[PDB]
Amino acid sequence: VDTCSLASPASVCRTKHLHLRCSVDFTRRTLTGTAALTVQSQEDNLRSLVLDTKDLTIEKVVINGQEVKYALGERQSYKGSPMEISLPIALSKNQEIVIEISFETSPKSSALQWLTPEQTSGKEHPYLFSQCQAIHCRAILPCQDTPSVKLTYTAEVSVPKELVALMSAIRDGETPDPEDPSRKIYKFIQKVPIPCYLIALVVGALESRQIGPRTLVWSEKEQVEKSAYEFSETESMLKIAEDLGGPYVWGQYDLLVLPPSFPYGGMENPCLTFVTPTLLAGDKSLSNVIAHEISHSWTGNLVTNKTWDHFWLNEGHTVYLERHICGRLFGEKFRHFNALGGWGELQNSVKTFGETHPFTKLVVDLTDIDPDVAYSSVPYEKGFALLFYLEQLLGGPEIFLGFLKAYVEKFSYKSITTDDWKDFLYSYFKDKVDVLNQVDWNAWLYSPGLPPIKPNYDMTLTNACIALSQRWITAKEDDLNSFNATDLKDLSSHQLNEFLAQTLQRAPLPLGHIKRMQEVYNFNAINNSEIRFRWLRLCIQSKWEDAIPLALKMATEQGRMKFTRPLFKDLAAFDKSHDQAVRTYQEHKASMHPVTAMLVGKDLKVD
Numbered sequence: 001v002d003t004c005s006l007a008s009p010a011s012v013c014r015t016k017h018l019h020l021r022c023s024v025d026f027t028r029r030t031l032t033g034t035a036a037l038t039v040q041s042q043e044d045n046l047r048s049l050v051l052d053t054k055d056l057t058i059e060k061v062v063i064n065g066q067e068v069k070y071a072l073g074e075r076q077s078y079k080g081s082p083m084e085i086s087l088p089i090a091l092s093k094n095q096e097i098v099i100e101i102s103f104e105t106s107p108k109s110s111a112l113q114w115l116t117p118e119q120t121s122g123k124e125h126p127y128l129f130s131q132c133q134a135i136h137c138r139a140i141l142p143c144q145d146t147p148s149v150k151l152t153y154t155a156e157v158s159v160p161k162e163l164v165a166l167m168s169a170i171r172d173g174e175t176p177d178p179e180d181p182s183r184k185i186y187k188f189i190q191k192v193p194i195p196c197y198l199i200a201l202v203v204g205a206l207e208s209r210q211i212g213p214r215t216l217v218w219s220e221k222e223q224v225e226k227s228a229y230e231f232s233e234t235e236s237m238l239k240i241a242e243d244l245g246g247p248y249v250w251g252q253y254d255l256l257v258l259p260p261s262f263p264y265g266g267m268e269n270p271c272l273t274f275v276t277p278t279l280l281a282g283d284k285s286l287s288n289v290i291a292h293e294i295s296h297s298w299t300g301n302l303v304t305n306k307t308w309d310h311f312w313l314n315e316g317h318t319v320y321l322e323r324h325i326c327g328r329l330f331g332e333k334f335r336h337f338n339a340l341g342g343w344g345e346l347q348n349s350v351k352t353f354g355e356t357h358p359f360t361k362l363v364v365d366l367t368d369i370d371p372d373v374a375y376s377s378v379p380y381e382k383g384f385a386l387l388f389y390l391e392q393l394l395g396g397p398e399i400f401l402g403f404l405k406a407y408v409e410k411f412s413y414k415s416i417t418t419d420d421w422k423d424f425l426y427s428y429f430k431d432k433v434d435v436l437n438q439v440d441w442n443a444w445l446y447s448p449g450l451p452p453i454k455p456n457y458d459m460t461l462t463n464a465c466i467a468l469s470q471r472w473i474t475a476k477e478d479d480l481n482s483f484n485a486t487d488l489k490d491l492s493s494h495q496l497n498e499f500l501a502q503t504l505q506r507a508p509l510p511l512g513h514i515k516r517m518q519e520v521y522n523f524n525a526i527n528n529s530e531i532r533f534r535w536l537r538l539c540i541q542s543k544w545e546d547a548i549p550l551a552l553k554m555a556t557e558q559g560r561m562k563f564t565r566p567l568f569k570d571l572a573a574f575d576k577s578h579d580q581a582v583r584t585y586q587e588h589k590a591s592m593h594p595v596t597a598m599l600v601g602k603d604l605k606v607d
């Protein structure tokens with residue numbers, strides 16, 4: 001049962017297709033139009049159906065050219081309001097009908113961020129972007145808002161003529177709007193069935209540059225050149241991913257670099273991956289995010305979790321595939337380094353939630369839980385650790401990659417549960433069932449805390465990070481003069497980041513140690529967002545007042561939640577910055593992404 005949805009389940013009726021015709025009104029901050037759903041009954045004598053909606057204004061519902069009766073139920077907090085539609089004629093099993101809903105979104109839609117010209121790079125045009133994952137598609141249009149249902153889609157999007165619309169689909173032309181010459185209509189087609197959380201829309205002053213045979217990079221003019229260089233390894237990663245997962249079925253693999261308020265590192269929107277501009281390090285060092293989004297074209301987009309309780313299936317396998325891509329490009333020692341780093345992030349999440357917390361379980365129960373509030377590294381890293389443990393138990397990466405490719409082939413275009421995955425794992429590894437029966441399944445899948453077994457990790461690249469972190473932690477005042485810029489000479493950006501993550505795990509350090517670290521390593525000069533974030537957290541947690549304006553500027557000049565949420569929490573925990581953190585959130589709240597504003601508010605205990 002999908003406990004996050006109020007719609008009729010897949011066992012009652014299934015949406016097969018969506019034909020969306022809408023107009024983006026920047027003056028009213030509304031998306032207005034019609035959502036024509038092709039629905040197939042799964043039952044005899046079907047007379048009504050229920051859809052998910054959230055803050056939607058419904059004008060009318062048309063079936064067979066006539067208006068029908070519908071009713072909106074009472075709002076159920078973050079789930080929204082159920083929409084019951086009375087069918088004009090009873091449907092037989094497998095019968096399909098088209099339901100056309102005339103609707104309008106709220107300016108406060110939790111799926112959307114409306115940006116004024118001043119919040120963009122160009123300063124002349126506004127911008128709009130969506131983020132449906134997990135359950136925000138219902139805040140854009142009426143739908144069965146559940147990943148247990150897969151549908152194809154077509155769309156016609158009217159926008160001011162000076163702007164460009166893009167979707168999670170193949171571009172199908174553009175024409176001037178026949179109703180308004182100041183507007184253009186952009187057309188789109190998504191021929192592969194997808195869960196509704198993969199529907200995405202961006203409208204802005206966008207330009208593109210080709211970077212591969214099947215890839216364009218899109219952004220505002222100011223970011224095009226830097227993005228083309230930053231993401232130049234994309235095609236090489238797509239080739240490795242095809243070798244590991246089988247055919248890439250989506251046609252195009254484009255990238256869109258969003259404005260800084262984009263709330264996540266990326267979004268695996270089919271045909272058009274969305275990315276944070278915080279990846280623009282200048283040296284391609286944050287390209288594992290591209291490898292992760294590319295991987296989702298198999299794990300997540302083809303093989304989807306049936307409900308949000310099984311989200312680890314999506315993430316665990318994606319991180320697993322991501323780490324193999326980076327291991328093929330940079331070596332097996334690099335794959336072990338990234339995997340060991342992941343275990344450390346899992347340790348941090350478990351410590352933050354508490355070792356008995358229900359969100360530290362691999363398979364969760366989201367009944368009455370806002371999925372955005374449950375979001376953490378647990379499904380990613382505890383899911384990756386399980387797969388990495390099984391890889392070692394079952395004979396190594398070559399054998400386990402055979403399972404991964406067979407798993408994708410088996411479940412492509414389907415929505416599955418942990419039991420479907422486990423059953424297939426046992427089926428594929430039938431000759432190793434005795435080995436599989438030694439796994440503590442109940443602990444791995446259903447128990448909170450760190451997993452029952454830690455995998456084996458090559459330490460080659462991690463050793464220097466640990467050694468330097470330990471020198472700093474054990475140093476007394478009279479040892480501070482021994483540190484010098486030469487300590488960092490043989491460290492890659494990845495190793496510098498790991499040195500900071502290891503040190504941050506033992507924070508606070510004495511204030512004098514942090515001041516010396518800035519004196520000798522000049523970490524304040526580093527623009528790499530991952531490094532800068534860990535360094536600023538280390539300064540704030542070590543009570544360095546000089547770091548306060550730096551941490552506030554980072555928390556506000558970008559909005560990636562991975563960075564913004566811990567920076568505001570650390571700034572609120574430091575007595576010297578507490579009031580500034582609260583005031584800064586208060587002044588920026590109206591202008592923040594709606595999900596980010598809600599979560600930062602909860603973290604700060606500011607209503």
Ligand SMILES: N[C@H](CC(=O)O)Cn1nnc(-c2ccc(Oc3ccc(Cl)cc3)cc2)n1
Binds near residue numbers: 134
């Ligand atoms: N998919 C993007 C690209 C990438 O992951 O690389 C990143 N992303 N964007 N949005 C979301 C997202 C995911 C899940 C959510 O609900 C939960 C949380 C935890 C659980 Cl156990 C179940 C359900 C809510 C939001 N994730």
Ligand SMILES: [Yb+3]
Binds near residue numbers: 172
């Ligand atoms: Yb066409």
Ligand SMILES: [Yb+3]
Binds near residue numbers: 426427
């Ligand atoms: Yb079985």
Ligand SMILES: [Yb+3]
Binds near residue numbers: 478479
């Ligand atoms: Yb000493």
Ligand SMILES: [Zn+2]
Binds near residue numbers: 292296314315
């Ligand atoms: Zn992911």
